[PDB]
Amino acid sequence: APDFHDKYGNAVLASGATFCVAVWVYMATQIGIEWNPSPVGRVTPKEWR
Amino acid sequence: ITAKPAKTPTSPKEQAIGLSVTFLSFLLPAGWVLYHLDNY
Amino acid sequence: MAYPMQLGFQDATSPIMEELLHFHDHTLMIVFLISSLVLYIISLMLTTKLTHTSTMDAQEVETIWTILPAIILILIALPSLRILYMMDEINNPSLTVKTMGHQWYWSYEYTDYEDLSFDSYMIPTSELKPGELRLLEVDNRVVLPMEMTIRMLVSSEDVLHSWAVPSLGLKTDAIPGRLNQTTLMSSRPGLYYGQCSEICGSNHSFMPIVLELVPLKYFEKWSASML
Amino acid sequence: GARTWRFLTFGLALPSVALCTLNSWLHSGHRERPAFIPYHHLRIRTKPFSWGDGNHTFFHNPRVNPLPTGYE
Amino acid sequence: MFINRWLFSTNHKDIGTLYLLFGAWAGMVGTALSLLIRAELGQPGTLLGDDQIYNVVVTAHAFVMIFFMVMPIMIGGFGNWLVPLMIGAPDMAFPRMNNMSFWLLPPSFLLLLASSMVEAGAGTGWTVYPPLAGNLAHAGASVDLTIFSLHLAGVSSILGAINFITTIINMKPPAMSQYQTPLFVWSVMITAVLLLLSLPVLAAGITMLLTDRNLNTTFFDPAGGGDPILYQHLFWFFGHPEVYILILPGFGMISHIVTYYSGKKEPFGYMGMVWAMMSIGFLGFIVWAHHMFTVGMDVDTRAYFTSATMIIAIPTGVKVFSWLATLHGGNIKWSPAMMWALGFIFLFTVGGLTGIVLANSSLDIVLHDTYYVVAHFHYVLSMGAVFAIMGGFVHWFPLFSGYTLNDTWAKIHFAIMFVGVNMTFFPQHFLGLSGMPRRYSDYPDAYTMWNTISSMGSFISLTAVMLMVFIIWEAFASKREVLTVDLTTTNLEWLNGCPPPYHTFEEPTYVNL
Amino acid sequence: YEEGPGKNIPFSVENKWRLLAMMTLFFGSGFAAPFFIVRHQLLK
Amino acid sequence: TDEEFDARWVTYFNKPDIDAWELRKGMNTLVGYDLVPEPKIIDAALRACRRLNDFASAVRILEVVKDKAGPHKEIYPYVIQELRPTLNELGISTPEELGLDK
Amino acid sequence: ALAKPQMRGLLARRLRFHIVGAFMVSLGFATFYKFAVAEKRKKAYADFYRNYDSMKDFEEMRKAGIFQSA
Amino acid sequence: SVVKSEDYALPSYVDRRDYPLPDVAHVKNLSASQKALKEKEKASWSSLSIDEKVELYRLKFKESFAEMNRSTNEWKTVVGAAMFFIGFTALLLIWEKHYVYGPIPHTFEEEWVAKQTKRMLDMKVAPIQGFSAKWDYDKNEWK
Amino acid sequence: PSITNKRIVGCICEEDNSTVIWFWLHKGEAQRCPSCGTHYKLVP
Amino acid sequence: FENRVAEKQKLFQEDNGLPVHLKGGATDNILYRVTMTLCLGGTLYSLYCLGWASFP
Numbered sequence A: 001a002p003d004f005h006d007k008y009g010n011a012v013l014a015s016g017a018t019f020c021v022a023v024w025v026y027m028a029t030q031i032g033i034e035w036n037p038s039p040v041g042r043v044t045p046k047e048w049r
Numbered sequence B: 001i002t003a004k005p006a007k008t009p010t011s012p013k014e015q016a017i018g019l020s021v022t023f024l025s026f027l028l029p030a031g032w033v034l035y036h037l038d039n040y
Numbered sequence C: 001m002a003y004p005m006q007l008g009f010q011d012a013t014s015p016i017m018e019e020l021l022h023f024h025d026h027t028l029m030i031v032f033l034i035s036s037l038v039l040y041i042i043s044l045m046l047t048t049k050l051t052h053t054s055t056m057d058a059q060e061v062e063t064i065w066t067i068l069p070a071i072i073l074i075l076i077a078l079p080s081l082r083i084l085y086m087m088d089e090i091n092n093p094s095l096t097v098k099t100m101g102h103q104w105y106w107s108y109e110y111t112d113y114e115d116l117s118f119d120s121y122m123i124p125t126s127e128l129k130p131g132e133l134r135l136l137e138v139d140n141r142v143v144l145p146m147e148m149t150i151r152m153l154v155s156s157e158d159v160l161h162s163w164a165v166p167s168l169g170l171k172t173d174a175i176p177g178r179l180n181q182t183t184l185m186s187s188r189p190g191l192y193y194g195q196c197s198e199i200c201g202s203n204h205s206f207m208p209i210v211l212e213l214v215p216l217k218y219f220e221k222w223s224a225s226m227l
Numbered sequence D: 001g002a003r004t005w006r007f008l009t010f011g012l013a014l015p016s017v018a019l020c021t022l023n024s025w026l027h028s029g030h031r032e033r034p035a036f037i038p039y040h041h042l043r044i045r046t047k048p049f050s051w052g053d054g055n056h057t058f059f060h061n062p063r064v065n066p067l068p069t070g071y072e
Numbered sequence E: 001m002f003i004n005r006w007l008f009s010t011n012h013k014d015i016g017t018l019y020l021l022f023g024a025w026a027g028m029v030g031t032a033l034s035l036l037i038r039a040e041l042g043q044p045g046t047l048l049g050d051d052q053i054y055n056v057v058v059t060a061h062a063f064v065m066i067f068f069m070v071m072p073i074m075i076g077g078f079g080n081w082l083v084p085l086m087i088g089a090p091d092m093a094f095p096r097m098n099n100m101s102f103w104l105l106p107p108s109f110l111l112l113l114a115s116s117m118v119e120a121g122a123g124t125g126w127t128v129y130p131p132l133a134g135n136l137a138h139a140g141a142s143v144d145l146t147i148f149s150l151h152l153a154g155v156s157s158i159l160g161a162i163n164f165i166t167t168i169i170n171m172k173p174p175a176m177s178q179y180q181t182p183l184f185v186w187s188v189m190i191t192a193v194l195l196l197l198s199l200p201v202l203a204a205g206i207t208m209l210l211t212d213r214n215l216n217t218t219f220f221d222p223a224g225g226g227d228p229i230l231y232q233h234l235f236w237f238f239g240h241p242e243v244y245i246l247i248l249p250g251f252g253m254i255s256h257i258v259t260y261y262s263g264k265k266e267p268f269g270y271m272g273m274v275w276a277m278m279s280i281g282f283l284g285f286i287v288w289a290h291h292m293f294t295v296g297m298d299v300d301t302r303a304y305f306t307s308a309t310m311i312i313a314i315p316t317g318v319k320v321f322s323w324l325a326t327l328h329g330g331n332i333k334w335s336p337a338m339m340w341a342l343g344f345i346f347l348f349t350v351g352g353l354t355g356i357v358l359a360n361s362s363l364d365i366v367l368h369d370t371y372y373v374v375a376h377f378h379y380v381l382s383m384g385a386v387f388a389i390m391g392g393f394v395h396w397f398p399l400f401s402g403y404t405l406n407d408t409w410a411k412i413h414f415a416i417m418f419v420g421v422n423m424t425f426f427p428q429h430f431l432g433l434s435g436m437p438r439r440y441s442d443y444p445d446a447y448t449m450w451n452t453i454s455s456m457g458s459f460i461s462l463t464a465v466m467l468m469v470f471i472i473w474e475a476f477a478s479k480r481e482v483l484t485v486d487l488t489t490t491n492l493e494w495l496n497g498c499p500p501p502y503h504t505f506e507e508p509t510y511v512n513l
Numbered sequence F: 001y002e003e004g005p006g007k008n009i010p011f012s013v014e015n016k017w018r019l020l021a022m023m024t025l026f027f028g029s030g031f032a033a034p035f036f037i038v039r040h041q042l043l044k
Numbered sequence G: 001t002d003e004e005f006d007a008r009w010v011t012y013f014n015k016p017d018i019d020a021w022e023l024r025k026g027m028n029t030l031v032g033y034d035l036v037p038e039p040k041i042i043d044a045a046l047r048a049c050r051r052l053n054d055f056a057s058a059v060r061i062l063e064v065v066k067d068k069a070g071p072h073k074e075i076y077p078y079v080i081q082e083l084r085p086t087l088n089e090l091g092i093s094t095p096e097e098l099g100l101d102k
Numbered sequence H: 001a002l003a004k005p006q007m008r009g010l011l012a013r014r015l016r017f018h019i020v021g022a023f024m025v026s027l028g029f030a031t032f033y034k035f036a037v038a039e040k041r042k043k044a045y046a047d048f049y050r051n052y053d054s055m056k057d058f059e060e061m062r063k064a065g066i067f068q069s070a
Numbered sequence I: 001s002v003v004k005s006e007d008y009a010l011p012s013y014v015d016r017r018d019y020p021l022p023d024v025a026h027v028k029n030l031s032a033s034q035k036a037l038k039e040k041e042k043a044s045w046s047s048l049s050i051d052e053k054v055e056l057y058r059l060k061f062k063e064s065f066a067e068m069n070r071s072t073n074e075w076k077t078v079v080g081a082a083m084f085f086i087g088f089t090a091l092l093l094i095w096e097k098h099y100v101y102g103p104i105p106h107t108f109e110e111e112w113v114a115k116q117t118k119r120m121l122d123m124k125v126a127p128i129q130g131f132s133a134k135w136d137y138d139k140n141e142w143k
Numbered sequence J: 001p002s003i004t005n006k007r008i009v010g011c012i013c014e015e016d017n018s019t020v021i022w023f024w025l026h027k028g029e030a031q032r033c034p035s036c037g038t039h040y041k042l043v044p
Numbered sequence K: 001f002e003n004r005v006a007e008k009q010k011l012f013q014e015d016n017g018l019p020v021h022l023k024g025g026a027t028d029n030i031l032y033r034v035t036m037t038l039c040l041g042g043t044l045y046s047l048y049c050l051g052w053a054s055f056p
């Protein structure tokens, strides 16, 4: 007799993965979090004095 | 280990209620305090 | 100072810090290798259906398990202790400077010749000049001659503090009633930053250290101008 | 029991000896001999020794034991 | 009946149950404290207030996790439940004194929570160093309430240690030598010896701090000829043994879990495992000043403490390799308890190795009072002591309760916790090497990325803690009653059924010579 | 004294919903306490 | 030596009046070793099952030979090959012949 | 007919083969790490200081306006 | 075969590949036809049918080796559910960012970071490997 | 000896084994240690 | 004095189901009630004192 994993495993794996990636990508990029990456190769230095 | 089947089975719906109530009991009071930090 | 996304030590400013980088590289290789070997052996023990569950004789294998680690510790201890004794070696300083920790700022005393002393406080975030570093700049930097052996003496007039400059390999506790000694020698001019490294109350996070390393002649004129 | 005392012999006592042996064999190098000073409280001679020339101590080491008149 | 049973207990199992409930509640407090820490550090700037409120939270976090969560669960909970059963004893030697060890902890905890409510709290660090902890820089009741909290927890564990040593020495079957007792029983006896010898020295030191604060003594006050560094020696004379106290019973539970889920009758190299635990216990008394490499001690003293500390890797290595040799050839059951134990072996090894880095005085100059130390101790505590507790809890819950956990949920719980603790602590190595100090409410801007990631990790660990409460609820809610347990021939604690009767071994075991 | 599953504990498991309430209050009060202590310290 | 180990195990299972307890003790002890038992040992264990009127234990013994081979798929078919004369003589069906490999 | 395969010590043989494999990889990693980390660092510091002019470094910093004292 | 709580002290049945011959038969009580089958087992096994042999196996044992050793889809549920709860955690972090965290300090503004970057290059922060080492002072650009 | 109809036996199969083998011995026919086969008989 | 241990042995072994802390008679109940009343009342007073000390 098929168990919970046989019936729902594929959907739990696919949905869980999709949901996890989507919400972490949104959190990481869309809500103003400051990661403060390296300026190297990214920032143009500007006169400060 | 072997065990008997559940004497009082917890259905998926019942588990969703228990998990929901558990999470809210942690999240609502802390959330109320942190939301109100400015006022404090 | 540290830079964003930094993984390792600040670049060495002093020969002893250079020595600590090479010693850390050697130790880290060993840590990587042992961690890796344990994870690999776990994965090896767990990936066969072959079994052997009868009693296993331990004594031969326990020789390997104790000797090889004993040898590895000796290979760490030897360079570890060479560096320990190298920092302790007699060097003849040209200059003595004192620092006193306070809640929540450093005072400096240069009293070889004249009575020069001043307080060194964090620049508030709202008073930073463009390009200056949050929580790291001070009003009055510790100006010192580059390429010279300096004796730093460290104490406190209240609670514990600790006077640290990572890029020079320095950390000396500031204890009331005690005068702790360390030596400082910068291979380079520049600005070298540190932060109070003993929990000392409300503004422990906000009493940093800034060394300004310049030629002797500049240090002399600065000293004279600070009396 | 004997089992316990054997456990202490091999698990604590001989490991201690092995570590002190390592400690000692790491500081076994010959130290720099100090300048000779003919101090009157040292190299005592009130009677010649009953062996050799009378002026050498029993386990005399030429490298580190000066005579009353200095290093050989 | 309820009062007689649960307030007046003289029963090792019920008292073990009280300890596990107490420890579980304490773990929720310590978790909340850990999230406030990581909320403060999760973005640059100030969230709560200055370093005082922050360090009250940090200080309370440590005391709760160590004194109210790990020690009560490992020693009071697993020790009381399992030790008598594993030696066929009818109870502890001092079943009424046992109950006072338990009932001292609620009051101890009440005094710690009082410290945090009065004045501005004890923002001292869990080390409580003077003069910050003295009556000038911490005027008022907070530090005294912390000292008294420690006194009651101290008495609890000293009387508990007398109870365990006596029970384990005196109450085995007469044919059973000490070399026929299970490794968990050894791990508790050795832990009890460490507690008996170390806690009285802590008691002396914090009593001196109490008299400096209230009776005009000057043990730690240079104005009277005292020395703040004397407090540090007395504290750490206790504090290094204390970390061995925190891990030893975890070592014992790991030996049982690895043996059990490898389908083995016995751990590899039993006498080596006994030797290793006794060696670690002894060496743990002669290394304390590795907590003091920056205070200004003499170079030869630093050389001695470096060397003596590194020696601990040898016996610890024998245990790690013996656990691997127990897995070797096993019929491996991938139970949730086995997952905790395998995570333990690996993550404990990593934290032990960062401890060997710190043992080097010269390198410790730059790592001391940095997040590198924080990374080391959370690998051994939050991924070592905690993984052994979680493994032991899921392994023995059916013995204690008579009910099974949902193994799928327990594996989910393991996976979430594994991700969260690594995301929390792995990046703290980088923060340490690059110079971020300990006990800071805020950091220079360069440290932002690793602090951000670490705080996100802490939230994943919170999700695992919430799920664990649900999983325990689901087990009691569903009532799946245990039927058969494998390997009872080498796991005596299971042989009286699940749960065992209130009175076991009324008729002792028969063991001949 | 009562022996057996659900009887060797100082709390009832006779009703899973009453148990959920009791567990919610027990673990919830422990987790809440530090947030309310911080609120208390901030409000002085 | 290998021949001495195998001879001890043949002798163990060949004891005419071996009892059920001894048959179990034997097989449960033998499967703890780092080996797949030689056909001559299995032959002697299967003839013990016959003396004990225990068909089911004979089938289980063939299963545990396969299991002890782990991923070495060549070992079980080799052992069955060597046992065919005994299986035919005693009327022992293999697990595969009984569908107990599904 | 099938050949008699090896039937004894298969777990011990797998262990021996892979511990030797682990030793060999361990030596491969140590050589790699010597070259990619340890020696790279010795050479970076040696190359930096070989022709380093501390007074010229100071003059650059001074002209950029970084110092209180110069 | 009903296993009872009150039976814990009696020899019990197990399916374990390392304990192939357990201490008791799976089925102890025999029907009339199961009794006749055990009598027939005392004669030549060649005279037993395939069905009778399977029936004798299933009286002695619960699961075959193939059944007790089978793989499951459980890993899908565990990994999927773990990813769901880790996803849920990001909701808590979104909530925290929106309702708890105020603005970050002005030193993270793009123009501040550009100026601070130049000042770090002017003071030659980490000039051997870490930072200024990655700046080309001759060409005025990152290497 | 027993005052009831079963008692736990621990069998130290060989001198100085660290592993004790535990089992219930029941009233009736002698039982054997499942490790060494040593016979034990209950005398209630 | 005279040896009256046998009379105390009879009293404390009497088959009356009392726990040892109450088996001496009515005086044990009184001293028990005094002890537990002072402990519980004292504990409630310590909580009141915390409430008071928790505010300025």
Ligand code: HEA
Binding pocket: C034, C038, C068, C069, C070, C072, C073, E127, E243, E244, E246, E247, E290, E291, E309, E310, E312, E313, E314, E316, E317, E318, E320, E348, E349, E350, E351, E352, E353, E354, E355, E356, E358, E359, E360, E364, E367, E368, E369, E373, E376, E377, E380, E381, E384, E385
């Ligand atoms: C469970 C808790 C626990 C455990 C077990 C340990 C174990 C060890 N700890 Fe740690 N430690 C802490 C908890 C713990 N620690 C805490 C809480 C602090 C901070 C206190 C404070 O300031 O608040 C701390 C701080 C601390 C310091 C001070 C650092 C500083 O403040 O600057 C040092 C210094 O040596 C140290 C070292 C060690 C070492 C060498 C071990 C050893 O026991 C580790 C041994 C294990 C291994 C080495 C791994 C397994 C071995 C092998 C696989 C064999 C092969 C290995 C080799 C050849 C190396 N730790």
Ligand code: HEA
Binding pocket: E020, E023, E024, E027, E028, E030, E031, E034, E035, E037, E038, E058, E059, E061, E062, E065, E066, E069, E070, E073, E124, E125, E126, E127, E374, E378, E381, E382, E385, E386, E389, E390, E393, E421, E424, E437, E438, E439, E440, E441, E454, E458, E461, E462, E465
């Ligand atoms: C056992 C000890 C232990 C444990 C587990 C932890 C767990 C955690 N710790 Fe901490 N921590 C310390 C001991 C511990 N800590 C100590 C001693 C200090 C130094 C204090 C000082 O400087 O004075 C410290 C300091 C410290 C700092 C440094 C603060 C600073 O220097 O400013 C940080 C920063 O992130 C931190 C975070 C965390 C986090 C996020 C967790 C999370 O991993 C926690 C997650 C939750 C759990 C692990 C569950 C716990 C609950 C249970 C296990 C109950 C189980 C229930 C049953 C079995 C029924 N802790």
Ligand SMILES: CCCCC/C=C/C/C=C/C/C=C/C/C=C\CCCC(=O)O[C@H](COC(=O)CCCCCCCCCCCCCCCCC)COP(=O)(O)OCCN
Binding pocket: D057, D058, D059, D060, D061, D065
């Ligand atoms: C290796 C482990 C230890 C070995 C012990 C000794 C070995 C040889 C001698 C045996 C007897 C020892 C007993 C103690 C007596 C006196 C001196 C012994 C200590 C010794 O051996 O000292 C040596 C001198 O011996 C000297 O003079 C000369 C010594 C020889 C003559 C001794 C004559 C005196 C005898 C006195 C007897 C009295 C007995 C008492 C009886 C009591 C009854 C009531 C030291 O050598 P050194 O070159 O000065 O310094 C080293 C420089 N590199």
Ligand SMILES: CCCCCC/C=C\CCCCCCCCCC(=O)O[C@H](COC(=O)CCCCCCCCCCCCCCC)COP(=O)(O)OC[C@@H](O)CO
Binding pocket: E093, E094, E095, E096, E097, E098, E151, E152, E155, E158, E162, E199, E200, E203
């Ligand atoms: C700042 C102020 C903080 C002070 C906090 C004070 C803390 C608690 C208050 C203490 C109240 C004590 C009440 C009396 C306790 C008596 C314990 C006792 O006497 O325990 C005995 C066992 O301990 C033994 O022998 C040997 C051990 C006897 C120990 C007696 C009590 C010691 C309590 C203080 C210990 C502190 C340690 C000092 C060293 C640092 C008896 O064991 P039971 O299980 O009862 O019986 C077993 C039956 O078979 C007996 O017939």
Ligand SMILES: CCCCCCCCCCO[C@@H]1O[C@H](CO)[C@@H](O[C@H]2O[C@H](CO)[C@@H](O)[C@H](O)[C@H]2O)[C@H](O)[C@H]1O
Binding pocket: B026, B027, B028, B029, B030, B031, B032, B034, B035, E035, I092, I095, I096, I099
């Ligand atoms: C570290 C542990 C905590 C992690 C984060 C917890 C996640 C938060 C859970 C929800 O918490 C709630 O959030 C609401 C907002 O979403 C708050 O309502 C507040 O905001 C609402 C919307 O503005 C108003 O309607 C309410 O009156 C007001 O109390 C409410 O009090 C609070 O309990």
Ligand SMILES: CCCCCCCCCCO[C@@H]1O[C@H](CO)[C@@H](O[C@H]2O[C@H](CO)[C@@H](O)[C@H](O)[C@H]2O)[C@H](O)[C@H]1O
Binding pocket: E332, E333, E334, E335, E411, E414, E415, E418, E419, I068, I069, I070, I071, I072, I073, I074, I075, I076, I078, I079
């Ligand atoms: C970042 C840390 C993440 C941790 C991730 C945890 C992964 C969860 C694994 C759950 O998946 C199941 O695991 C079982 C074991 O738990 C497997 O048993 C199967 O495979 C095993 C062979 O190794 C056998 O022992 C079993 O008999 C057999 O049924 C089963 O098929 C598999 O679906």
Ligand SMILES: CCCCCCCCCCO[C@@H]1O[C@H](CO)[C@@H](O[C@H]2O[C@H](CO)[C@@H](O)[C@H](O)[C@H]2O)[C@H](O)[C@H]1O
Binding pocket: K037, K038, K039, K041, K042, K045
């Ligand atoms: C079994 C039940 C347990 C018994 C519980 C008893 C509780 C009642 C105690 C009475 O309370 C007292 O109140 C006094 C107020 O009059 C206080 O006096 C003290 O505080 C005064 C307040 O002004 C000062 O004058 C002095 O410090 C001093 O007299 C004193 O602290 C306190 O004890």
Ligand SMILES: C[C@H](CCC(=O)O)[C@H]1CC[C@H]2[C@@H]3[C@H](O)C[C@@H]4C[C@H](O)CC[C@]4(C)[C@H]3C[C@H](O)[C@]12C
Binding pocket: C059, C062, C063, C064, C066, D003, D006, D007, D010, D011, D012, D015, E271, E272, E275, E318
């Ligand atoms: C002698 C004692 C007990 C043996 C027994 O009676 O069973 C055993 C137990 C563990 C052993 C030790 C451990 O195996 C660790 C070490 C292993 C080395 O190969 C020898 C020294 C070493 C330190 C061993 C000496 C001795 O053989 C010990 C101490």
Ligand SMILES: C[C@H](CCC(=O)O)[C@H]1CC[C@H]2[C@@H]3[C@H](O)C[C@@H]4C[C@H](O)CC[C@]4(C)[C@H]3C[C@H](O)[C@]12C
Binding pocket: K001, K002
């Ligand atoms: C008379 C009485 C008999 C005791 C008895 O056998 O019951 C004696 C025996 C020993 C006596 C005690 C001891 O001789 C020691 C004490 C001597 C002092 O002179 C009187 C009090 C003193 C404390 C005595 C009191 C009393 O007289 C005792 C107790």
Ligand code: CUA
Binding pocket: C101, C102, C104, C160, C161, C162, C196, C197, C198, C199, C200, C201, C203, C204, C205, C207
């Ligand atoms: Cu001054 Cu921290």
Ligand SMILES: [Cu+2]
Binding pocket: E239, E240, E243, E287, E288, E290, E291
């Ligand atoms: Cu330590």
Ligand SMILES: [Mg+2]
Binding pocket: C162, C197, C198, E294, E368, E369
């Ligand atoms: Mg410090």
Ligand code: NA
Binding pocket: E040, E041, E042, E043, E044, E045, E046, E047, E441, E442, E443
């Ligand atoms: Na902050």
Ligand SMILES: [Zn+2]
Binding pocket: J011, J012, J013, J014, J021, J033, J034, J035, J036, J037, J038
């Ligand atoms: Zn036996």
